[PDB]
Amino acid sequence: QIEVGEHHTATWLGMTVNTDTVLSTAIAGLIVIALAFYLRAKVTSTDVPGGVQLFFEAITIQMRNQVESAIGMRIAPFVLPLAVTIFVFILISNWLAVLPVQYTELLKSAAADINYVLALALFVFVCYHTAGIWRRGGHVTLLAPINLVEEVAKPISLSLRLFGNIFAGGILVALIALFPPYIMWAPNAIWKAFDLFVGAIQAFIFALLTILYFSQAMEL
Amino acid sequence: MDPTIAAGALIGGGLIMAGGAIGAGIGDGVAGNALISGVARQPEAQGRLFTPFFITVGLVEAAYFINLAFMALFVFATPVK
Amino acid sequence: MDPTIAAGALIGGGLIMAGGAIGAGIGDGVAGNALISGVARQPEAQGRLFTPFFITVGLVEAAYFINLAFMALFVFATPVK
Amino acid sequence: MDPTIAAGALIGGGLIMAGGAIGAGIGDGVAGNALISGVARQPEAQGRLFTPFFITVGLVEAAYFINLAFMALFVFATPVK
Amino acid sequence: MDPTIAAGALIGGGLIMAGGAIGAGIGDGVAGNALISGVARQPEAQGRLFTPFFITVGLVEAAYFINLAFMALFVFATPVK
Amino acid sequence: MDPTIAAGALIGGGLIMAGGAIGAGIGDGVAGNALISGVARQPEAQGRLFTPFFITVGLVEAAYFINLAFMALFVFATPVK
Amino acid sequence: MDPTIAAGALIGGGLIMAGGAIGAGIGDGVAGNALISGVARQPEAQGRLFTPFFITVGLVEAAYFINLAFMALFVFATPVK
Amino acid sequence: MDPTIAAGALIGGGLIMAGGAIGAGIGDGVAGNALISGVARQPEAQGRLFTPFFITVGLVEAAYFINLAFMALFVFATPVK
């Protein structure tokens, strides 16, 4: 029968660590850096770009438009590279879940575990806090408590929306398994189709909220 | 005995998925109602209207799929016994 | 005592499809509202107005079908039993 | 005993038809609102405004009929038993 | 005790008429809000707005009437007894 | 013995009048909003707008009054004993 | 015997006041949005706008007051016993 | 026994405060939307608009405060005991 997301684990420094999540996030990272080397070797300028270059440049200028609309690029240029990895590292991190492995499968996405999204969201938090302190050291003072929550609810909602939006898939891939295999394919098909849309939209909103939260941090 | 907690887990998990579907479904309506109308006002604005649409959906659907996560914590992994 | 979790599964599954049909019925209503308005405005935009329509409806139906799948999990495969 | 399941179907089956009607009754209202205004703005549009209108009402009425069926399945089949 | 079924019919039948009244009540308002506006904008069109109005009210009142039928099946028949 | 039926009658009647006042209050509000907006735009229109207004308030108030009659039927005159 | 009927009276009275306050609090909020909007667009209209307004609120408040009376009847008079 | 009446009264007070909260919140939101819109469109209007705004808020808020009062009368001074 169905069970919640348990893990295989190993102890590396007194603390136990999940064997997958760390495996599938490494599989995502190596493919990302493999595309980075392959593009950097293939890179064009006077000649016509190939598929990987016209893809990654479309993402970099989409991020450039967003960051330069939000803040002057003279002030905060580093939020662009930080934003495109947050898009593409997360994008691949969801896409690999489309290929069939199950029989219980280890190959759940990196965001189907809360630790991954907590590390990313907490990193984004300390980064934008360092951005705020770097510029010097809301829109109404009397809202301090909400502006108090904002600093918790930004990383907590970032992590929780990324977790929930992907953890549901990690459950539904098991749910349709309970139906007869000779009829289970069609709902499995539809859901696999929708998986890409939610994975992409989720990577998109996390990157955009990262930019827009950074914009709000480094104000004045 | 356990069966009263397990009945409470099914009723209480059911509420989390009921309020989820109402909030998301209506949200992606009131947001989509502003997209379609936009693409009816300037039939060539669609391209950019996806940038604020998928932002609003990403905020709305979050309130549903965070509910769905916690519903699995209610239904399969009941924090109380 | 199986009947107590049985009744809990039925009330939970009932709530899941109550919230599902409200989210679906009102989301498609508010989306088709904008569809009819935009087709009354620019009758030639109909062919285009379906692509922002069948997205929202599409999205909305996700939050109905997922409730219909979880209703089947509560009712035909009750998790704790 | 078994009665505790019986009412569990009558209550849960009621909930399925409660959220069903709030889904249809509001949906057909908010879709119907956009047809009456359209026709109120140009009477010659009543010919073409039925093409989007009955689509939406189609989707909407599905979300009802499915709950209707499921109510019968609750009241005349009592699955969890 | 068998009287729990009766209580399940009264509570459950109560939901089938609670959801129906929210279906008709608002569904007819959101629909009439258009007719009162169409007759404000264009008085001589009052003759033709009654077709879109009685289609949309006809669909919305069907959700109430059907519900009222099943509520009578719940309370005067009690299928599961 | 009577008490579970008596509690079920009171809770069932409570649901019927809860849903009744929601259907009534919001439908009258949304109909009255178009009435006030028509009288805002056109002072000469008031006599024509009252027709559409009282048609829609009729269709609304019927649904509240029928709920009030069924709550009275549940609470004073329980059909199941 | 009697205390469980006392419960049904308190919960049923609570439902009646919950639905009354939702129907009324939103009703006035919607009918009032037309008054505020009309007086923004036309300061000169404030004299006429109070007649259609106070009709609508009246009808709305009737749904609150009738529910307030039936809650008092449930909790103080307790009909079934 | 009295504790069952205690739970009934507590759930009754919860329902009364819950429906009160929904009413007051959404009514203030909708009436406030028209106030913010009137002050956007007509920069001088804020003086006149506070009469329609505090009339409509005055009604809405009443439907809250009344539920608050009645809630205390339910929990501190349980009418049935």
Next chain:
Amino acid sequence: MDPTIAAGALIGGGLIMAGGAIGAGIGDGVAGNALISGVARQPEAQGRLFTPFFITVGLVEAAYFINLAFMALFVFATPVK
């Protein structure tokens, strides 16, 4: 026996915070809609629009905080005991 009063207080807190969040969230949404529309229509208004906005959000939030206070007054310092 306290456990019944405990469950009553827990479901009462559940209702109070469910209603307060529906009210506050939708009130803040509907007030925020007018604020963004005002800033997108008259950008020169952006200084003044915070005034009406934080009046209306002030009223909408008050409805939350009170509830949040009283839910703690049910859950940690239960009135009935």
Next chain:
Amino acid sequence: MDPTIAAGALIGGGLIMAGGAIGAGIGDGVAGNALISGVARQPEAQGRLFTPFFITVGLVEAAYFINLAFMALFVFATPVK
């Protein structure tokens, strides 16, 4: 015994999360409906519209996550036990 409080925390917490998802998923939509429309009319305004947007969403999301905190407190840390 304790299992009645346990179930009381799951149903109480389930309500908190249902109301949080309805309030927030709709708010984030009703606010977003502004944003999209703004960008559909004056794309040049996109950069400024995110300022009043994330103020309103900043309020709305807080009403979700405060509800998530109180549901978590109810279910993991049942205060009265």
